[PDB]
């Protein structure tokens, strides 16, 4: 099954962290990376002007069950990143999200697939469209149509 994972990071030197996360993803059992998008740049959230986020998408072929893959992405988030001490609840220094898992729809307590907000997020959709331009969502919606219709701004490259 091809899973699509979003990776995000702003902390320390994002290139170094993201590459280490990519290696970890490749090391997940019963799985291999098929392709990785370009690295994209997205401006911080909040007027306070934080570092830029590095964003990318990964296509991972896997024979793991969806919640097994979740275990691994959570483990990698724990091993490769941390919470922000002031904003324990905020995003972690390294974010991994399963956006899609083949054509499966999943609504469990620990896992919601497709990612519940991804159709609203250019920073998820654009890298995905680079590596899967003909992607169709389980509900039948075409990735290309969402980008075209909703007229998202492109992202700059990292």
Q: Is 22 exposed, middle or buried (0-12, 13-18, 19+ CB in 10 A)?
A: middle
- Report the number of distinct structural domains present in the chain: 1
Report yes or no: 58 and 4 within 8 Å, Cβ to Cβ: yes
Report yes or no: 67 and 110 within 8 Å, Cβ to Cβ: yes
Residues 6+ apart with CB under 8 A from 23: none
Residues 6+ apart with CB under 8 A from 108: 67
Q: Give catalytic status of residue 82 as yes or no.
A: yes
22: its two tokens: 């990519």
Greatest CA span in the chain, whole angstroms? 43
Domain limits for position 55: 1-158
Among candidate residues 75, 82, 110, 150, the one labeled active-site is 82
115: its two tokens: 């990612």
Beta-bridge partner residues of 6: 57, 97
CATH number at residue 38: 3.30.70.560
Q: Give catalytic status of residue 75 as yes or no.
A: no
Of 149, 131, 157, nearest to 34 by C-alpha is: 131
Q: Give catalytic status of residue 97 as yes or no.
A: yes
Resolution of the experimental structure, in angstroms:
1.5
**Experimental approach taken:** X-ray
């Amino acid at each position: 099954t091809v899973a699509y994972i979003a990776i995000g990071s702003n902390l320390a030197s994002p290139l170094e962290q993201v590459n280490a996360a990519l290696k970890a993803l490749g090391d997940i059992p019963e799985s291999h990376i098929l392709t990785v998008s370009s690295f994209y740049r997205t401006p911080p959230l909040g007027p306070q002007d934080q570092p830029d986020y590095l964003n990318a998408a990964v296509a991972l072929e896997t024979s793991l069950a969806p919640e097994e893959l979740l275990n691994h992405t959570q483990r990698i988030e724990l091993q490769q990143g941390r919470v922000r001490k002031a904003e324990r609840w905020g995003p972690r220094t390294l974010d991994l999200d399963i956006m899609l898992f083949g054509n499966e729809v999943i609504n469990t307590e620990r896992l919601t697939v497709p990612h519940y907000d991804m159709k609203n997020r250019g920073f998820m959709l654009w890298p995905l469209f680079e590596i899967a331009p003909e992607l169709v969502f389980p509900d039948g919606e075409m990735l290309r149509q969402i980008l075209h219709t909703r007229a998202f701004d492109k992202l700059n490259k990292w």
